[PDB]
Amino acid sequence: RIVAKHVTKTTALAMLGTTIVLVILQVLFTYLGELSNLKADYSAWQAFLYVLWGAPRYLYEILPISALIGAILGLGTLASNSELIVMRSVGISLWRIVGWVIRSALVLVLLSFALSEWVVPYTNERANSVKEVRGYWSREGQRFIYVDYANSQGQLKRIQVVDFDDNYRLKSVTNAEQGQFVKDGQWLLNHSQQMAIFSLALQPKYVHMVTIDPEDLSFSQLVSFMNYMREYSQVPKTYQLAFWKKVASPFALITLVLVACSFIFGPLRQQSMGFRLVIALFIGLGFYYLQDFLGYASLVYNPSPAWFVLGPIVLMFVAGSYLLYRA
Amino acid sequence: QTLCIKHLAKNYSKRWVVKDVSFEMQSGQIVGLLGPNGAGKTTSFYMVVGLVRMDKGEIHLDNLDLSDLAMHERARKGIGYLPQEASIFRKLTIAENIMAILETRKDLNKQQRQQRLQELLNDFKITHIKDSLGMSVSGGERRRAEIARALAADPKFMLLDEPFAGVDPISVGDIKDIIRNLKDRGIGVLITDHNVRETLAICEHAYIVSEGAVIAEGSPQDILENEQVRKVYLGDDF
Amino acid sequence: QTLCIKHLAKNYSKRWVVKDVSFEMQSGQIVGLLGPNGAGKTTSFYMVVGLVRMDKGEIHLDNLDLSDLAMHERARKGIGYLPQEASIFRKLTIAENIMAILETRKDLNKQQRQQRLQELLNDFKITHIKDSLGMSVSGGERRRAEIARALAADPKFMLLDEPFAGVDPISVGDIKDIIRNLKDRGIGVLITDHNVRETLAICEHAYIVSEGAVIAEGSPQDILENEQVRKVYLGDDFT
Amino acid sequence: IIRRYLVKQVVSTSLVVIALLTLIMMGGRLIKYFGVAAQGRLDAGVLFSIIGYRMPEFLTLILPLGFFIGLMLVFGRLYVDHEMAVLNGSGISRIRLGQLLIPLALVFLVIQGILMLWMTPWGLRQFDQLSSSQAVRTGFDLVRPKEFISSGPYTIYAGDLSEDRKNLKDIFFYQDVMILAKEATRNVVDLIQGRRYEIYSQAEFQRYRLRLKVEALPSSKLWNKWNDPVIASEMGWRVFGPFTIVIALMMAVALCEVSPRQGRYYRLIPAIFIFASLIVLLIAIRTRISRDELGVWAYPAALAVYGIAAALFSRK
């Protein structure tokens, strides 16, 4: 227990220190980029508030690389002090130390979950305000609905619904000027100009989610909205990529921590602390580039984004396990 | 108990630093794995410890093969290791340092774990620093704490890497007494160190390894009067 | 020439590692700066070299102050340094290793520089391996090449850090012969080493530094017979 | 022989660092460009041309930084393996070793002058022309599978799309002209198994054919006109910018003293941040001159302030 507490506390302190350092270094580096966007209504204080409100998002996007670098630094501090060697010499396996470091990284995993569900969706809205959909086009089965204005409270302005059959022939082109939402599957409206050659599946609750990019949506919102679209429509590939990227974020963090531990016990053993930090930065940049590139490639290639998202994670986990097996 | 090691061989950069290094040890016996620097004593000792993977050879501990086992598995089988460099837990107190390894023992409960901690602290005269951090103690006190921590795991063979490294001649007697006490505790000791003169004073069986192979075997007196060893390692005058 | 060092003192993290360390070493004299580990012998040796800046004290070389001079300026004044670890230029040939420091000498032309290179290679028996890289040589050959390069720097006082470090007893005699050769070249030698026994065999004047101050002085016989050193450093039983 | 050794070491490690930093800092932007292309806002077959035309612009930052890191790597290696103790112990100071590399620093300064005065403006001109060519794409060029894309009076939905942005499936197009086609291949687009409607006219068809900067100016044109604050800022940047390899030489010498235990890469991050601060100041000054608030005189001074402060740090 004392060994476990010591390793977990040291690695958690390393992760938290790296997290604070990286969040500060990204806030003060995004502020530099934002200082060139100043105008009459966007002063330096407004830009600082916009960057600061985005701090939870920067933290959420840093937690994987933060955990990787923190594990690297903490295990390097233990190894350079010859603490891991005596830990092995007393009967503690490599996988036990890796499990302790993973227990330490579970705090960052929980922090990532809390940010993604409760903090990031709210502060992102605040950040945009410092700096509800119009012209919404949607498909419901064989019908196409274009609503010029849609409101979260249940207001529709200039709706146009065009129906179709399996033969793709016009059936009804209905239009209205104003409309209200009363229940699922039915909307009241005035000026019911229905052509011939009511029920619509749009829901106000998801209206605010249309403008938001799939990456910026919280997991609960993404699942609810994606469930709604799969029920009434076809889910786009970018939404599937976002879902597989969010559901595999804790797994990616744990795998990156395991890779850091394997590197410390393997290639990065007896190396200097500066070299370990440089290699940790290189691995973090490589991970942040591979995940982004494969996410983009999932949107252009036939295979499902699940493959492009769970490929790097599984492969890195296998590589780390093999490096740990080599001791 | 006996530790037999046969035909150790390891190559680095396609050259065999160690070629057929074999030696035998017994519990409560001091054995010195000596030889010219870089000729394979360090690599052979590390393969015995488990730091360096074994390309060729067989390690048995009382007809129990340890060649395929890893470092931690060998440690659980009854092998302890004492690194030359400072290996104390810097942020843990000396009492916590020993108790951290005492908790690993499965055949002790807390009531006897505390007693074992107290008697280990009193054995090495480190009770006065039991509440002090491991990174704020003297070299000798830190080494005694490391030895107590290693013995807290109850090893059957202690593998010491250069105990007489950076040790004044006044404090060489203390290290010799500590190693003699380790022998008297029923635990064999394998010492590897470049200071052959005071390593041959406590070791009761010495193996000299040169050119990657064992060139001599026997007591330190026999080692000194060995033509090959004086030809390669100790010189004409010693 | 006489390098005289007075009142060395240095603190590290509010702890006075070295307190009033003073000693004199003449040219052509082997002087051993020994003592218990961590008691200030290594720090005093480094401040003599110039690796770590002094906090108190002065250094003179025939009334030529070296206290404020940097390490390279002292080297230009005639002080060479031999580190314990492998300090040879890894990707430079041994002949190139010696020549690169020979080219620094402003009192030698190419015709004389080549002759000096050849005779330095000959004296240290490294002519046979003059075409190999510095990183692909044996430990003894590497140390011989480093000493040849240091002599190519033309020093008046060579400060050796742990010459008998990781050295077999067979090579201890060879290193002793090397240091005696540097003595016979008119170059004083200041040796610091953990191995007190073998260091005391060639040094003709030993300074023992304990608790940050010099406690002993004189020939190694006096050092061994000194009761204070045996009480703090050597022990009652020592040979 | 010490000079050739140092020059070879610095050139090798600095070329390695320059290639590595080029890979790192161009792969990220190329991945961003590839994401844009996968969103249909950029041709996937041209993004390589985009990153090839910005080779000089990225290199104008990688060269000062790559040289700085290579200098740090060489000097830190000299310190770690005790090759600096024997060089200082032979009368050759660290400042002397840095001065021995003045010809190499001048070679890199000439290279960076070539990039910033000629190569970078040409690359930026070609990249701006290419971006203007790629900023006009509209219609079925911007379509994404299972999504509605609105461009001008056009609304486009495609149920499927190939790996390349051709061979659409389940195509719905809205102007008003509404066309629903089973297949479509690409603005000239051939639609297969389609229906056209006017909202009321109907027409079925088996096949149908549908038909819906100062930074880049040449140095010759910017050598004069120093009165214009924007032109003055750009030209002074092009002139006083290549002198960041002289400041990367006398500062990497200052911030390279590392203990053998400390490591070769220990001091990189703080001094890389110091060099980044130098460059960030050189960019804030450039912007201030562009806004007519500071004047060109701040270009050399910003270097000299870093030139002196480094030099003093090398002589403490």
Ligand SMILES: CCCCCCCCCCCC(=O)O[C@@H](CCCCCCCCC)CC(=O)O[C@@H]1[C@@H](NC(=O)C[C@H](CCCCCCC)OC(=O)C[C@H](O)CCCCCCCCC)[C@H](OC[C@H]2O[C@H](OP(=O)(O)O)[C@H](NC(=O)C[C@@H](CCCCCC)OC(=O)CCCCCC)[C@@H](OC(=O)C[C@H](O)CCCCC)[C@@H]2O)O[C@H](CO[C@]2(C(=O)O)C[C@@H](O[C@]3(C(=O)O)C[C@@H](O)[C@@H](O)[C@@H]([C@H](O)CO)O3)[C@@H](O[C@]3(C(=O)O)C[C@@H](O[C@@H]4O[C@H](C(=O)O)[C@@H](O)[C@H](O)[C@H]4NC(C)=O)[C@@H](O)[C@@H]([C@H](O)CO)O3)[C@@H]([C@H](O)CO)O2)[C@H]1OP(=O)(O)O
């Ligand atoms: C001698 C002299 C020598 C020196 C010479 C000079 C120097 C060399 C010169 C060479 C040339 C050069 O520059 O070379 C590069 C730089 C070289 C380095 C700098 C100089 C250093 C000098 C000192 C050394 C290239 C460059 O600079 O490319 C820009 C790009 N920048 C980056 O990519 C920077 C980062 C990092 C750079 C760091 C420094 C490296 C060198 C040391 O990577 C790289 O360099 C690549 C590589 O990996 C670097 C390797 C790093 C490691 C190196 C190690 C070396 C050894 C030590 C830009 O990215 C957008 C954002 O990307 C990420 O954030 P994110 O993911 O959240 O989105 C970035 N964060 C991250 O990655 C996360 C990082 C943070 C960084 C950490 C750094 C650590 C060191 O932490 C981590 O990783 C965690 C781990 C690490 C932690 C920290 C340790 C954000 O970083 C920042 O803030 C940081 C700053 O830059 C400052 C940099 C540091 C300075 C010290 C970024 O700002 O996008 C730009 C284009 O931008 C547009 C475009 O104009 O086309 C616009 C853009 O819109 C927005 C915006 O979002 O930004 C919003 C908008 O409102 C407005 O405000 C708008 C805008 O403000 C004003 O217009 O900006 C976006 O557009 C759209 C979109 O649809 O999406 C529509 C938007 O809306 C529309 O906009 C229109 C418009 O305005 O046009 C308008 O008309 C419309 O009406 C409007 N409609 C509506 C409806 O509104 C909006 O919807 C938006 C949406 O929200 C999504 O973004 O999207 C975008 C599009 O995405 C593109 O695809 O397009 C590129 O410019 P471009 O190349 O010229 O092109």
Ligand SMILES: CN1C(=O)[C@H](CCCCN)NC(=O)[C@H](CCCN)NCc2cccnc2Sc2c(Cl)ccc(-c3ccc(N)nc3)c2CNC(=O)[C@@H]1Cc1c[nH]c2ccccc12
């Ligand atoms: C607005 N700028 C641009 O054009 C560059 C693109 C440069 C190449 C264009 N092909 N865009 C960017 O900012 C993109 C992100 C958004 C992209 N839209 N990446 C960031 C970046 C890249 C390169 C250089 N700095 C930066 S960030 C920066 C830095 Cl490090 C330091 C200070 C300032 C600053 C200046 C004045 C001020 N009051 N507050 C702040 C900034 C803000 N940025 C800027 O001032 C620069 C000024 C500039 C114009 N020409 C240059 C040529 C070389 C170097 C700099 C410049």
